Amino acid sequence: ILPIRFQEHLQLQNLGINPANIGFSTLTMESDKFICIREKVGEQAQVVIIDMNDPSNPIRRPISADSAIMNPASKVIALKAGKTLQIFNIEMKSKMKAHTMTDDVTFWKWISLNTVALVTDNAVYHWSMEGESQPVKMFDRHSSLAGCQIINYRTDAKQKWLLLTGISAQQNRVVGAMQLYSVDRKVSQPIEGHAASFAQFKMEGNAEESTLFCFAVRGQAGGKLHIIEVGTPPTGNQPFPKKAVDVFFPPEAQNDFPVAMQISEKHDVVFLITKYGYIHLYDLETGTCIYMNRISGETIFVTAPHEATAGIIGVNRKGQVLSVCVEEENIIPYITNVLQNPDLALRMAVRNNLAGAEEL
Amino acid sequence: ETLLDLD
Amino acid sequence: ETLLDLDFDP
Numbered sequence: 001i002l003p004i005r006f007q008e009h010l011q012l013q014n015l016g017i018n019p020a021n022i023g024f025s026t027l028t029m030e031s032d033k034f035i036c037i038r039e040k041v042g043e044q045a046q047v048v049i050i051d052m053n054d055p056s057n058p059i060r061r062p063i064s065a066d067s068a069i070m071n072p073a074s075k076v077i078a079l080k081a082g083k084t085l086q087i088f089n090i091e092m093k094s095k096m097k098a099h100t101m102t103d104d105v106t107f108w109k110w111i112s113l114n115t116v117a118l119v120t121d122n123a124v125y126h127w128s129m130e131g132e133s134q135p136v137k138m139f140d141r142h143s144s145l146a147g148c149q150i151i152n153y154r155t156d157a158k159q160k161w162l163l164l165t166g167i168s169a170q171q172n173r174v175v176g177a178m179q180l181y182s183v184d185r186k187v188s189q190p191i192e193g194h195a196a197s198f199a200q201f202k203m204e205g206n207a208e209e210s211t212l213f214c215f216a217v218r219g220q221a222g223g224k225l226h227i228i229e230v231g232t233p234p235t236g237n238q239p240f241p242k243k244a245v246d247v248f249f250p251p252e253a254q255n256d257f258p259v260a261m262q263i264s265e266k267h268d269v270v271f272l273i274t275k276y277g278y279i280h281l282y283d284l285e286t287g288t289c290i291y292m293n294r295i296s297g298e299t300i301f302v303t304a305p306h307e308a309t310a311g312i313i314g315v316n317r318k319g320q321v322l323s324v325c326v327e328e329e330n331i332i333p334y335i336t337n338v339l340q341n342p343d344l345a346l347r348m349a350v351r352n353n354l355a356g357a358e359e360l
Numbered sequence: 361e362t363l364l365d366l367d
Numbered sequence: 368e369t370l371l372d373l374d375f376d377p
Binding site: 189 | 368371373375
């Protein structure tokens with residue numbers, strides 16, 4: 001028995017996608033609802049839109065854009081060409097917004113159902129789709145990210161804690177540089193890290209939820225995962241005890257590094273995926289490592305939360321669309337019998353109302 | 361300028 | 368000032 005379930009959803013090459021376009025600059029997956037791929041047939045650039053609830057019928061439309069990102073929940077698409085940004089409601093066949101920047105945008109994404117984040121060489125902006133909103137500057141970039149490839153931007157639920165992540169080669173290894181910004185304090189902190197996420201977590205005995213920041217890193221001296229509360233705890237709350245635990249890289253994977261993290265608030269577990277296709281599962285409360293294995297031979301370059309299972313969905317270099325989630329009927333007996341950790345098994349059973357700790 | 365052709 | 372104390376010495 002395994003504590004996780006693997007599932008193949010699609011092979012993109014079977015939907016007519018050219019394998020040269022399956023990669024970070026041309027394929028976007030902003031949620032589990034859609035995948036968008038930019039392709040060029042002759043001199044005509046186009047976008048292919050795959051509805052994940054009807055994937056055998058993809059739509060190809062002509063474009064003149066260098067990047068395209070679909071809204072997480074709706075057929076509303078953002079396109080850009082250098083400094084020109086445009087937003088379309090596809091079913092309405094209408095241009096809902098247009099804005100001209102004064103810098104090129106090196107990375108962008110949807111950070112909520114209604115707000116786009118825009119990263120330039122110098123700063124980070126938020127752009128709300130509500131009313132007549134224009135972009136607002138959130139913070140200036142820190143010099144520690146100068147010259148990095150920007151690979152992600154994330155926030156907490158309330159958009160008060162903001163995190164930008166870049167990577168580069170230093171001393172023949174892939175080095176991660178993050179910038180954590182506090183909206184209320186107006187202060188940045190540089191942190192060495194590769195992949196991260198925020199989470200809401202309600203501790204035993206507390207009336208309010210805690211806001212947690214979890215980040216993984218491969219440093220000079222090996223891999224580490226950190227779980228720490230950000231900000232002042234709500235009035236009356238016990239503070240969350242911070243944890244730091246090892247992240248294992250085998251001796252044969254000298255160049256591998258963390259590329260993605262999703263946290264399940266249903267199960268309170270952390271899913272961590274590496275560049276070269278290794279999955280790790282950790283308990284969010286204690287930081288205990290539950291499981292590790294290689295699940296892809298091809299590299300993984302994009303992920304999102306998988307809503308149906310509360311897991312993680314991803315796309316590899318070949319075009320396999322794959323997901324991993326907690327196997328609810330096996331996780332408790334696995335932790336008891338394979339990990340031989342009855343303490344964790346009992347906790348996770350009662351905490352998330354799972355079966356299998358009746359016998360320990 | 362129009363970045364997507366819907367017609 | 369720093370945002371997070373990332374020395375995990377108790």
